[PDB]
Amino acid sequence: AKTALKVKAARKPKFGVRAYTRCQRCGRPHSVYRKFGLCRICLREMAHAGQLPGVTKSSW
Amino acid sequence: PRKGPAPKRPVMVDPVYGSPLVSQLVSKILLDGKKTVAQNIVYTALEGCRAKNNTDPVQTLKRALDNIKPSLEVKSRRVGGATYQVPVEVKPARQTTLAMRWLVNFSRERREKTMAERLMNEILDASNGLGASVKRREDTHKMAEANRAFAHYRW
Amino acid sequence: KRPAMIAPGAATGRRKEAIARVRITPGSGQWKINGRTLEDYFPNKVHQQIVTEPFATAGVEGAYDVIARIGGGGVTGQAGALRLGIARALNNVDPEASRPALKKAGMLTRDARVKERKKAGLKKARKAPQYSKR
Amino acid sequence: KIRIRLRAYDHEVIDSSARKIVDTVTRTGAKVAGPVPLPTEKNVFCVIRSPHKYKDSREHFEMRTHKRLIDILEPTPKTVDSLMRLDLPAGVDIEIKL
Amino acid sequence: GQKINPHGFRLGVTTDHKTRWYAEKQYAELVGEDVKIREWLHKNLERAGLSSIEIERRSERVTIFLYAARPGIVIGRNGAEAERVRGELEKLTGKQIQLNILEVKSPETDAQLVAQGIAEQLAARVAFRRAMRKAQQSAMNAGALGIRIKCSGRLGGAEMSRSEGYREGRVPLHTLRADIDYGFFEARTTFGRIGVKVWIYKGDVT
RNA sequence: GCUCGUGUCGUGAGAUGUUGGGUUAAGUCCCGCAACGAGCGCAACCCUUGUUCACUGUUGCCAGCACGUUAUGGUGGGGACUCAGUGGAGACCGCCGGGGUCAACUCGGAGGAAGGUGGGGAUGACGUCAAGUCAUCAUGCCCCUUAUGUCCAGGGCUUCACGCAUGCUACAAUGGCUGGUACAGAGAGUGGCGAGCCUGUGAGGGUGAGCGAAUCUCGGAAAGCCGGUCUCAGUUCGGAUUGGGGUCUGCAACUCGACCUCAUGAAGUCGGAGUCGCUAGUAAUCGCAGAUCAGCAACGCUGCGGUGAAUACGUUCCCGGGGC
Ligand SMILES: [Mg+2]
Ligand SMILES: [Mg+2]
Ligand SMILES: [Mg+2]
Ligand SMILES: [Mg+2]
Ligand SMILES: [Mg+2]
Ligand SMILES: [Mg+2]
Ligand SMILES: [Mg+2]
Ligand SMILES: [Mg+2]
Ligand SMILES: [Zn+2]
Structure with a gap:
C-alpha cells in the first residue's frame, strides 16, 4: 500500500468510527484477520514458512 | 457406467402393510426428502382405498401396478441419418419402476384437491382399468406395436 | 435352536452422530427412552420398527424390558443408534444362540455413513455451481 | 484444591509439561489428580490461495490449542514454592489458581 | 506455479515451527514484533548468511536463535557486533532480548x-x-x-x-x-x- | 504420465528401455523381451471419519451408595456407561474355495465395526496457455517532482432506454396461518457474549448477574409430529413496490445502512430455443455457526449437523482424456 495511507491508518483517527485495520506486515487493507493482524497473502506465506505458532494446514 | 453394473440398494418393507411395494411407493412420492409426509400421504391413500372397497389396499395397489406395468417400450436409435424407435422388452424391475413413476406423476396431475386421495383415486381407477396411467401404458404399448418392425435391432 | 437366554446386559449404540446407551433387563417388555416411553419419544410408527425388530429377529420377544439414554443426532439417527445398541446388548448377552441370525440380518454392524463435509468451490459436499460456458 | 491450567499448541510439549509438574509435586509429596484433557480449541482460517481473481482454490489452516488440567489436592507450601519457581518450555503457558 | 511449500506441507508432521510462544491477547502484536525482528535481522545481516531465525518468549522476554553459516560477522570483534545488534533489538522491540548465534554444521x-x-x-x-x-x-x-x-x-x-x-x-x-x-x-x-x-x-x- | 544414466540399433535427427500378452483406480503389478537400471509422478507415510483397549475424571459422565426445599450429578462419591484427548490395537486378498499355464490379479465365502483403495481431505509430475497479478509484496527500465507527491470537506465507486451471468423468494394444499410439543452438530465471546427481571405491539430501551469460558452467554435449532383453521380463489398463495410512524449503530444514515411496526399488495398459474448439478448419507431440502465487521445492503463465502431419495440395461451417439 501507499506509505501515506499506512501512516494515516496507524495514527489515531479523528472519529473513532473512521479507523481501519491494514495488514501490519503488508499494508493491505482487504482481508485482514483480527486474531493475528496480517492479511490473506501474509497469513498464507507466513504460516507456510512457520513463523505463526499453532497455525498448520487443515485437512479434516 | 463403463466399469460395470453398480450395486442396487436393497428395498425395505413397509412396517404397516409388510410389503416392499408400499415402501417403493412412498420412496417414489418422497418429495423434498420428507419421508414422514410422503408416507402419511401413502397411508391415507391406502386407507381410503380400503374404505371405498372391502378388498385389501395392498392387493388393490398390486392390481393397479399390474394394470400399469408396460411390457415393451421404444428407445431412440441413431442408425443412419434418421432416428429409429426400437422396441425393447422391459425387465420386471424396470416395469415396476415405470408403473410406480407413472402412477405418482398422474396422481400429481389429477384435478382433485389433496395429493393423498388424488393418489387414492388414481390407484382405484388403475386397478379397475381406467385412468391416465393405464392410458399411457396402452399408448406406449401401441407405439411399440407400431414400431415393432425394428425388433431385429436389439443387441 | 434353544430359545436363547433372558439375562440382563448392556451395550452402546452409535449411528449418524447419535449415541445410544442401552441397558436390557428381564421384564414385561416395556420401554423408557430418556424417561419418556417409546410411544412418546418415537411418536410415530415410521421408525419404531427399526428399534423393535432386534427382538423380533432374536429369540426373545416383547417380554424383555429395556432402558435407553439417547443423545445427539436426529430422530432417525437416534433410532438407528438405539437399534445397534439393542443388537449389541443381545449379542453380548447370548453370543451363541442370537449371534448368527443377529449378525446375518446386518445388525451387529455400524454404518459409517456420515454427512460428507462441504468443499471449497462447491455449493455442498458434491453439488457444484452452475457451469456457464461463455 | 490448587488448579493448574496448561495451554499450548503441541500436545507433546503439553504432555511433557504435565508429566514434569505431576512428578515434581509428587517428589514433594502432595498427591495430585491426574492430568485431565480439556477439549482442544479449534480455530479455522480459509484463505484464497492466489493473490488475485482465483477464489475457487483455497487453503485452510487451524490453530489448535491443547489444554490440560491438574489439581494439587495437598496444600504443601513447599510444592507451592516449587511450582512457582520451576522452568517450563516457552511454547506452553501455566495458570495457577490458588 | 502449482507446488506447495515443502516446509508448510511438512509443518507439524516432520518439521517444526520457527516461533514458540503462547499468547491469546497480544497475539497480533507479538506477531508484528516478530516480523520487525526478522525483517531487521535479514536486512542488516545478509553478509553472515541466515539459515533461520527462531523466536521464543517466556514473559516479556524474547529469545532469538540466529542460525548462521559464518557468525563471525554477527559477533564482530569480542562480541561488539553482537552487543550492538542486541541493543538495536531492544531499541526496536522494547523487551529484554537474549540473543544466541549458532553454526550450521x-x-x-x-x-x-x-x-x-x-x-x-x-x-x-x-x-x-x-x-x-x-x-x-x-x-x-x-x-x-x-x-x-x-x-x-x-x-x-x-x-x-x-x-x-x-x-x-x-x-x-x-x-x-x-x-x-x-x-x-x-x-x-x-x-x-x-x-x-x-x-x-x-x-x-x- | 514425463524423463534420465549405461548399453545397443541407426550416417543422422532419433530409437530401445517406455513395444507386446494379462491385469490394475494407476507407467499398478505380472509374463515375455536389446535391454539392464534409476528419477519425478501412482501408491504409502499425514489429517479426519467408522470398531476396540489401556491411561486420566473437570468445567464432562451417573451404573451401585448417602441427602438434597418439591425441585437441578445440586451434594459426598464413583471408573461402570457416554464423552473429552494422549498412546496402542485393527485390514494385509492375511485365511478358505474357484478361476487365472502358472503369475499379477479376479470371483465367492468365513471371521469382523469395516473387505478388496472402507468414506472424505491434504498432496497437483515434465510442461502447456508470452494464461492472471507491476494493485498484496518485491523489482529492471521509463515517466511525475509548488505535482502523477501529500492533507481535507463534499461527491463518486450504489447512475439506467438496456444485455448477460450467479443466486434468493416464489407461483401454493407434499401448502399458508395458528397453538402445543420433540431431536443436533460445529463454532464464537471482555470496547465482547449477556442471562434474569421491568418496560414497549415490536425493533428496542432501562437495570444487569455470569463468563477469558467442556463451567457463563450466544440458545431458539428449523424441517418434523400433534390440535385447530384456510378450501383451489391470482387466494388467508406470492411479498415486490409505495405512503406513515419508529429503533439502533455511528461525528453523520439525503445521495447510500440494517431493522421494527401500520397500511399498500405488483409480476408470478411452473417458464421458448437452449442449458446446469448430482451415483449415497449423494441429490433435494431444513435450519445453525464463523471470517471480515461500529453498523450492514450476507440471498455471498467457508463450515456444521437434521431429514433423505430415484437411477445406472449399457458404451451406439455428444464432450474431455489415455495406450498402441
Ligand atoms: Mg470500518
Ligand atoms: Mg467461470
Ligand atoms: Mg498421493
Ligand atoms: Mg497476457
Ligand atoms: Mg511502480
Ligand atoms: Mg461496485
Ligand atoms: Mg477464547
Ligand atoms: Mg463419481
Ligand atoms: Zn499483507
Whole structure:
C-alpha cells in the first residue's frame, strides 16, 4: 500500500468510527484477520514458512 | 457406467402393510426428502382405498401396478441419418419402476384437491382399468406395436 | 435352536452422530427412552420398527424390558443408534444362540455413513455451481 | 484444591509439561489428580490461495490449542514454592489458581 | 506455479515451527514484533548468511536463535557486533532480548545457505549453469541424498525469462516422512532479480 | 504420465528401455523381451471419519451408595456407561474355495465395526496457455517532482432506454396461518457474549448477574409430529413496490445502512430455443455457526449437523482424456 495511507491508518483517527485495520506486515487493507493482524497473502506465506505458532494446514 | 453394473440398494418393507411395494411407493412420492409426509400421504391413500372397497389396499395397489406395468417400450436409435424407435422388452424391475413413476406423476396431475386421495383415486381407477396411467401404458404399448418392425435391432 | 437366554446386559449404540446407551433387563417388555416411553419419544410408527425388530429377529420377544439414554443426532439417527445398541446388548448377552441370525440380518454392524463435509468451490459436499460456458 | 491450567499448541510439549509438574509435586509429596484433557480449541482460517481473481482454490489452516488440567489436592507450601519457581518450555503457558 | 511449500506441507508432521510462544491477547502484536525482528535481522545481516531465525518468549522476554553459516560477522570483534545488534533489538522491540548465534554444521547441505550462495554468485555475474553445478556437486560431496536447484528469471541478463534447473539423486516432494529442506533467495542483478529455489533431501525421518 | 544414466540399433535427427500378452483406480503389478537400471509422478507415510483397549475424571459422565426445599450429578462419591484427548490395537486378498499355464490379479465365502483403495481431505509430475497479478509484496527500465507527491470537506465507486451471468423468494394444499410439543452438530465471546427481571405491539430501551469460558452467554435449532383453521380463489398463495410512524449503530444514515411496526399488495398459474448439478448419507431440502465487521445492503463465502431419495440395461451417439 501507499506509505501515506499506512501512516494515516496507524495514527489515531479523528472519529473513532473512521479507523481501519491494514495488514501490519503488508499494508493491505482487504482481508485482514483480527486474531493475528496480517492479511490473506501474509497469513498464507507466513504460516507456510512457520513463523505463526499453532497455525498448520487443515485437512479434516 | 463403463466399469460395470453398480450395486442396487436393497428395498425395505413397509412396517404397516409388510410389503416392499408400499415402501417403493412412498420412496417414489418422497418429495423434498420428507419421508414422514410422503408416507402419511401413502397411508391415507391406502386407507381410503380400503374404505371405498372391502378388498385389501395392498392387493388393490398390486392390481393397479399390474394394470400399469408396460411390457415393451421404444428407445431412440441413431442408425443412419434418421432416428429409429426400437422396441425393447422391459425387465420386471424396470416395469415396476415405470408403473410406480407413472402412477405418482398422474396422481400429481389429477384435478382433485389433496395429493393423498388424488393418489387414492388414481390407484382405484388403475386397478379397475381406467385412468391416465393405464392410458399411457396402452399408448406406449401401441407405439411399440407400431414400431415393432425394428425388433431385429436389439443387441 | 434353544430359545436363547433372558439375562440382563448392556451395550452402546452409535449411528449418524447419535449415541445410544442401552441397558436390557428381564421384564414385561416395556420401554423408557430418556424417561419418556417409546410411544412418546418415537411418536410415530415410521421408525419404531427399526428399534423393535432386534427382538423380533432374536429369540426373545416383547417380554424383555429395556432402558435407553439417547443423545445427539436426529430422530432417525437416534433410532438407528438405539437399534445397534439393542443388537449389541443381545449379542453380548447370548453370543451363541442370537449371534448368527443377529449378525446375518446386518445388525451387529455400524454404518459409517456420515454427512460428507462441504468443499471449497462447491455449493455442498458434491453439488457444484452452475457451469456457464461463455 | 490448587488448579493448574496448561495451554499450548503441541500436545507433546503439553504432555511433557504435565508429566514434569505431576512428578515434581509428587517428589514433594502432595498427591495430585491426574492430568485431565480439556477439549482442544479449534480455530479455522480459509484463505484464497492466489493473490488475485482465483477464489475457487483455497487453503485452510487451524490453530489448535491443547489444554490440560491438574489439581494439587495437598496444600504443601513447599510444592507451592516449587511450582512457582520451576522452568517450563516457552511454547506452553501455566495458570495457577490458588 | 502449482507446488506447495515443502516446509508448510511438512509443518507439524516432520518439521517444526520457527516461533514458540503462547499468547491469546497480544497475539497480533507479538506477531508484528516478530516480523520487525526478522525483517531487521535479514536486512542488516545478509553478509553472515541466515539459515533461520527462531523466536521464543517466556514473559516479556524474547529469545532469538540466529542460525548462521559464518557468525563471525554477527559477533564482530569480542562480541561488539553482537552487543550492538542486541541493543538495536531492544531499541526496536522494547523487551529484554537474549540473543544466541549458532553454526550450521553443513552449510553446503542446508538449502537456505545454498540458495544464498547461488544468488550471490548470480549477482556477481557467474554463469548460472556453472554455479548450479558447483552447488549440486558440493551438496552430494557432503552427502545429501538428493539435490534440486531451479533458477528463474532473466538468466544471463537476457530479455526472455527462463526457468533453468538441475537435479539428481532423489527428491520425493510428495512424501511427508521425507525430510526435505527448502531454501529460496533472490539474486538482485542489474536486470531485475533471479529467483533461486533449492530442495535438499536430507533423508527419511519418522 | 514425463524423463534420465549405461548399453545397443541407426550416417543422422532419433530409437530401445517406455513395444507386446494379462491385469490394475494407476507407467499398478505380472509374463515375455536389446535391454539392464534409476528419477519425478501412482501408491504409502499425514489429517479426519467408522470398531476396540489401556491411561486420566473437570468445567464432562451417573451404573451401585448417602441427602438434597418439591425441585437441578445440586451434594459426598464413583471408573461402570457416554464423552473429552494422549498412546496402542485393527485390514494385509492375511485365511478358505474357484478361476487365472502358472503369475499379477479376479470371483465367492468365513471371521469382523469395516473387505478388496472402507468414506472424505491434504498432496497437483515434465510442461502447456508470452494464461492472471507491476494493485498484496518485491523489482529492471521509463515517466511525475509548488505535482502523477501529500492533507481535507463534499461527491463518486450504489447512475439506467438496456444485455448477460450467479443466486434468493416464489407461483401454493407434499401448502399458508395458528397453538402445543420433540431431536443436533460445529463454532464464537471482555470496547465482547449477556442471562434474569421491568418496560414497549415490536425493533428496542432501562437495570444487569455470569463468563477469558467442556463451567457463563450466544440458545431458539428449523424441517418434523400433534390440535385447530384456510378450501383451489391470482387466494388467508406470492411479498415486490409505495405512503406513515419508529429503533439502533455511528461525528453523520439525503445521495447510500440494517431493522421494527401500520397500511399498500405488483409480476408470478411452473417458464421458448437452449442449458446446469448430482451415483449415497449423494441429490433435494431444513435450519445453525464463523471470517471480515461500529453498523450492514450476507440471498455471498467457508463450515456444521437434521431429514433423505430415484437411477445406472449399457458404451451406439455428444464432450474431455489415455495406450498402441
Ligand atoms: Mg470500518
Ligand atoms: Mg467461470
Ligand atoms: Mg498421493
Ligand atoms: Mg497476457
Ligand atoms: Mg511502480
Ligand atoms: Mg461496485
Ligand atoms: Mg477464547
Ligand atoms: Mg463419481
Ligand atoms: Zn499483507
